[PDB]
């Protein structure tokens, strides 16, 4: 968990950022 990066975007905002 500490070595892995989680997410930080939803599913409606993926490549729209």
Numbering used by the authors: 125 to 141
The authors write:
Sister chromatid cohesion is mediated by cohesin, whose Smc1, Smc3, and kleisin (Scc1) subunits form a ring structure that entraps sister DNAs. The ring is opened either by separase, which cleaves Scc1 during anaphase, or by a releasing activity involving Wapl, Scc3, and Pds5, which bind to Scc1 and open its interface with Smc3. We present crystal structures of Pds5 from the yeast L. thermotolerans in the presence and absence of the conserved Scc1 region that interacts with Pds5. Thus, Pds5 can be considered the gatekeeper of the cohesin ring.
